[PDB]
Amino acid sequence: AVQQNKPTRSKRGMRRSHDALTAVTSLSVDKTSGEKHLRHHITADGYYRGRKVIAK
Amino acid sequence: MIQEQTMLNVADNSGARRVMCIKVLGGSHRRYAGVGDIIKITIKEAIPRGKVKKGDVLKAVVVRTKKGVRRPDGSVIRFDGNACVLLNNNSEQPIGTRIFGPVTRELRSEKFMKIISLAPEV
Amino acid sequence: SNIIKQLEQEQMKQDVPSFRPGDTVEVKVWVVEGSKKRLQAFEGVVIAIRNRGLHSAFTVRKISNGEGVERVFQTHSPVVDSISVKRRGAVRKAKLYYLRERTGKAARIKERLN
Amino acid sequence: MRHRKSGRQLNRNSSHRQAMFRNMAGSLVRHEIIKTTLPKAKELRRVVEPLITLAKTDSVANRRLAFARTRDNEIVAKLFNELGPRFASRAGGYTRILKCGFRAGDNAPMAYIELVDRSE
Amino acid sequence: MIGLVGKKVGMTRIFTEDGVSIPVTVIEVEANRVTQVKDLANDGYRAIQVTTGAKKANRVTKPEAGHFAKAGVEAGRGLWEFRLAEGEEFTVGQSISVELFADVKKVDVTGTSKGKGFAGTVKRWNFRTQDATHGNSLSHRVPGSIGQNQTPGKVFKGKKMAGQMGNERVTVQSLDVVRVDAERNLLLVKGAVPGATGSDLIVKPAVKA
RNA sequence: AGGACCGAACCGACUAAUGUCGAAAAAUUAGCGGAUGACUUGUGGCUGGGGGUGAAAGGCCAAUCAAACCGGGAGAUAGCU
RNA sequence: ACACAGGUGGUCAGGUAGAGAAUACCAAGGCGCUUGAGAGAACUCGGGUGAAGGAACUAGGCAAAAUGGUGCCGUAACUUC
RNA sequence: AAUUCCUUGUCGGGUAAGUUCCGACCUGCACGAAUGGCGUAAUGAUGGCCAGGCUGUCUCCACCCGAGACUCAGUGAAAU
RNA sequence: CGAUGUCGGCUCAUCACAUCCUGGGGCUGAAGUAGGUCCCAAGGGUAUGGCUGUUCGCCAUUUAAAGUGGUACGCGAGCUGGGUUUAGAACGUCGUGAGACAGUUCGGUCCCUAUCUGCCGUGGGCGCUGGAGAACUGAGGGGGGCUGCUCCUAGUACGAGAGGACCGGAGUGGACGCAUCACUGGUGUUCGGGUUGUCAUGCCAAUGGCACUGCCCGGUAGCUAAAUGCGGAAGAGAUAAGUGCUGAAAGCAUCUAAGCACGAAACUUGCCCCGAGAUGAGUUCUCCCUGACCCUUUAAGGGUCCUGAAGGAACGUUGAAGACGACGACGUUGAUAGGCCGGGUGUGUAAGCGCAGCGAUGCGUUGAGCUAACCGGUACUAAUGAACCGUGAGGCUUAACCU
């Protein structure tokens, strides 16, 4: 239950190949404030689908 | 669902009182025996006069079981005591005169016509 | 699923004399004696109803020769002829499985005149 | 192997789930809007809306029964007089969820859940 | 011959007026309609293509919407194929009904099974469980030894191990059909067929006789 | 009355499981034994290395014991690695 | 060795129920154990229930299950009574 | 026999079936009288065997509640 | 020897055939039956207990049979520790004594988070040469292959009888296997009820919290097995041992040398599942894009703007799909999820009141009230318009044909 030979920079680097991070690829803009929010999230200001629903 | 070491109540006036199954018959690696089946038993209790002694190995057939039979409609007849009769080891033709309690109708196997006859009910 | 219920109300028998658990009820059925056909009577106390439409069934406990016998009965079956209620019974539960251990005269239950 | 099961275990045993939902329902009744985790907020939505259904009838028993849940008279008094009969035209959805960002402490999917009026 | 695509509605019982209460399975087969007839001239084999059901027009796609508009049949969920037996000439657009089972006795249902997820070796392959006590230390359901020693030196391929159970296409043959009702387009077959109530399944007549 | 009885605090350590790069260089959980006596516990003293003490196992004597630990003979000697 | 499931002597010791300083729910008072959020696979740890059977398991009834109280009744061989 | 090698001795009992257990027989390899012989009430976390009771020990596992395992965010070893 | 853990047990195997059963034959001191012996055959199958640490054996009872062996006397980074194998203690015994005896008994710590191979699964990338969604092909590979019994033939053949068939057919089983939730059952800490103590909601009533779900009796859905369906084949091809026909060498004879006919669970298909990464990367259907422009050591060249479709992807509601990816359903033109609406189920007569009774408590309202995942309906809440990725007719040669 231990390694018998030290792996390399390749087998280290090749295992890390899928361990990279994705991208959001698209930031939906809202009607009123025109802010770039996440799709299906309220804005950081507070609007959502063109309405200050939160009244933050 | 009778099996090894199962304590049974005898269902005829033969001298037994309490018998233990030691082998189910008819097939290698065979598990449980139901109501139609023949099992080898022993004698754990006896009547003084009797026809059998304590510690006789002989053949039996389960006539009542707590697990119960299933009719062709799905209606299940469940009893309360796993009961059986005695059989003469060779060519069975049962040992006994009477039958106590009700037996079920699945004993119509043409060699248990005697056990049909001596039984009162069903 | 209407499709199953289509196939289920076309098959249930219609008489169905309704009762409750606790009742003493005499069920009559059809002992098919090969090519001959007689009728017997199973009479005891209903322990339980298993009421689900066509799939409904009910138990009955008959004491006979010190051997408690529990037969169930799929009600909508064409071997179960008729149901005749004999003694209306007063029970505060819908299942009566303590009848498997209480014996004798301390097993019999009350009347339900009401 | 979880086919057709409902409810969430929510990493809490049977008392704690029941006690929290008894507890968290009070604040949503009291404050008209609360900010929780989104997986909590969906299962909070299965509890308060039966209580608003109880507050669509002002019987003697429904006082007792909606007091038997949530154990609080002021929560019962918010129903049946203010929150209850006002909602009794729109039979159905009484609470609205909205997704918000991630909790700074441990990256949790925060969300609001709030009554569909919150009128002022 | 050919079989017929359908959908499982569940299981029911049927009482017959002599006694027995057979367990049946409800299969709503729709009007199955042929969309492509393949023949050995320019295809290498002869077979037919069949759709069934109904489909959302906003959820049918432009490569696939044209595939029905060249057949002239109405878009249904999914397509299937059937190997013909050299005496069954059809055409594209002939809606095959449930009248082909007017004298079929045992049909062979093929469908998918209910997925167990990651099964263990005791559920998936019926490995017997080790002893639950007499000192057995954190080993109550493990698969036990898997190989021999240095001389085969490796794990034989085909070893029954842990993994995925269910979610597999399965055929059950010789299942007796008891009702071929055509006004409701239903079919009642003895016993149980592959699971997932509501999922599609392919009925076919018996190869085995 | 009692090295008497059942049983907590208290003292012990039979069995099982866990744990075995541990929560821990000997524990936890569950059960188990004494439990007014040859009882247990605080405080302080006393007994030193071929010596002590030991209801005695070759046990204990600062996570060390068929002869402690520290420095010194001392870079012992090593037909062996 | 650590902000370590360990060790540590004395003192005060409330309400209900109970023989009780046990235990159970509370008081006074003090705390929620310095990572979280989901999912509800295998397999592991701690537990719950189980058809029919009832030690066949197994080195072995290991573990588990089971018994559990008070009051009266009744109680074997043997005995140093 | 805590002692008996041959030996699972032989007889009896217990089990359907008993290399262990109980009772005997002496053919004591190689018991034996304060390195004590032989008994013996009570005692024992003491060894051996049997019987009632109870049961997931097992026939043969099933489902369930939770703490891990798995996913994301944070921190972040190890033997080799 | 700077360590290969050493018996048996358990779990899991798997190969050989010198075959234990089933299959095929020849011989018989082979009448039948049942047997002996030899040849061919490895597809499948191939006991449970008692005693012992035992493998082994012995006994009991089955079975068609209870196969020999190889695999580190297979299997401890899988379990066990009873045996052998440390310290303690004792008997026999040998020794003056320390102690000693695969002589006896009693007791006596079993560590590892898996980098690589391997195997079980499950995906990401690229490829397959215009890009796209489907539906298949089948090279190749895997799974399955067991059999008892009664009955018909038939008391027929056979035989003095006693006994008792061959060949073919029917049915009901034992084991194993796949699937399934209708049935019968288990579970069901998300359903309803009973109840012990205590506490709290100001008090009564009525409730809740804690006590392993506090203890309990029931029990939807889902999930199960003991519940119920289903399988193993037929047939065809080529053969083994074998049996033959015709037939010379060798005027006869002769199953072989030419030629020809049968011949078994083994062999190849037939049954089931995977499968075009089968780089030999396959076929059919279908859908989508037909804008100009500069430059260059002018080459399948590179760059600039105008466009970005089929589609996919991402996000959201999500599922009998799931460890995570993945897979399916659905996104307002909507029933995917929740809520709701009526029902089903389960529990089994709520509360409040009235009446009766000294009271506990019983009656009537009332088969009430409450009901989880289920069934049928309803846009009430939630699934936003957009954005992102994927382009702009697709290499050279030759052939065959339209031009």
UniProtKB/Swiss-Prot annotation, chain A:
Molecular function as annotated in GO: structural constituent of ribosome
Keywords linked to the UniProt accession: Ribonucleoprotein, Ribosomal protein
Keyword presence, Nuclease: no
GO cellular component: cytoplasm; cytosol; cytosolic large ribosomal subunit
Keyword Methyltransferase: no
SUPFAM superfamilies per record: Zn-binding ribosomal proteins (SSF57829)
InterPro entries: Ribosomal_bL32, Ribosomal_bL32_bact, Ribosomal_zn-bd
Highest taxon of source: Bacteria
Pfam short name (any one): Ribosomal_L32p
BP terms from Gene Ontology: cytoplasmic translation; response to radiation; response to reactive oxygen species; ribosomal large subunit assembly
Annotated region described as Disordered, given as residue ranges: 1-37
UniProt xrefs under HAMAP family: Ribosomal_bL32 (MF_00340)
Family: Belongs to the bacterial ribosomal protein bL32 family.
The protein's assembly and partners: Part of the 50S ribosomal subunit. Contacts L17.
Name the record gives this protein: Large ribosomal subunit protein bL32
Organism expressing this protein natively: Escherichia coli (strain K12)
From Swiss-Prot, chain B:
InterPro entries in UniProt: Ribosomal_uL14 (IPR000218), Ribosomal_uL14_bac-type (IPR005745), Ribosomal_uL14_CS (IPR019972), Ribosomal_uL14_sf (IPR036853)
Effect of T97A: Reduced RsfS binding
GO biological process terms, semicolon-separated: cytoplasmic translation
Keyword RNA-binding belongs to the record: yes
Superkingdom of the source species: Bacteria
Self-association state and partner proteins as the record states: Part of the 50S ribosomal subunit. Forms a cluster with proteins L3 and L19. Forms two bridges to the 30S subunit in the 70S ribosome, contacting the 16S rRNA. In pre-50S ribosomal subunits interacts with RsfS, which may inhibit association with the 30S subunit.
Name the UniProt record assigns to this protein: Large ribosomal subunit protein uL14
Gene giving rise to this polypeptide: rplN
Curated annotation (Swiss-Prot), chain C:
SUPFAM superfamilies per record: Translation proteins SH3-like domain
A GO MF label: structural constituent of ribosome
This protein's GO CC annotations: cytoplasm; cytosol; cytosolic large ribosomal subunit
Pfam family, one: Ribosomal_L19
Family: Belongs to the bacterial ribosomal protein bL19 family.
Subunit structure: Part of the 50S ribosomal subunit. Contacts L14. Forms two bridges to the 30S subunit in the 70S ribosome, contacting the 16S rRNA. In pre-50S ribosomal subunits interacts with RsfS, which may inhibit association with the 30S subunit.
Protein name per Swiss-Prot or TrEMBL: Large ribosomal subunit protein bL19
Organism encoding this protein: Escherichia coli (strain K12)
Curated annotation (Swiss-Prot), chain E:
Function: One of two assembly initiator proteins, it binds directly near the 3'-end of the 23S rRNA, where it nucleates assembly of the 50S subunit.
UniProt keyword annotation of Cytoplasm present: no
Record's keyword annotation contains Ribosomal protein: yes
Entry-linked SUPFAM superfamilies: Translation proteins
UniProt GO BP: cytoplasmic translation; ribosomal large subunit assembly
One Pfam entry name: Ribosomal_L3
Name by which UniProt lists this protein: Large ribosomal subunit protein uL3
One term under GO cellular component: cytosol
Stored InterPro entries: Ribosomal_uL3, Ribosomal_uL3_bac/org-type, Ribosomal_uL3_CS, Transl_B-barrel_sf
PROSITE patterns (UniProt xref): RIBOSOMAL_L3
Gene3D superfamilies per UniProt: 3.30.160.810, Translation factors
Organism taxonomic ancestry: Bacteria, Pseudomonadati, Pseudomonadota, Gammaproteobacteria, Enterobacterales
Protein's organism: Escherichia coli (strain K12)
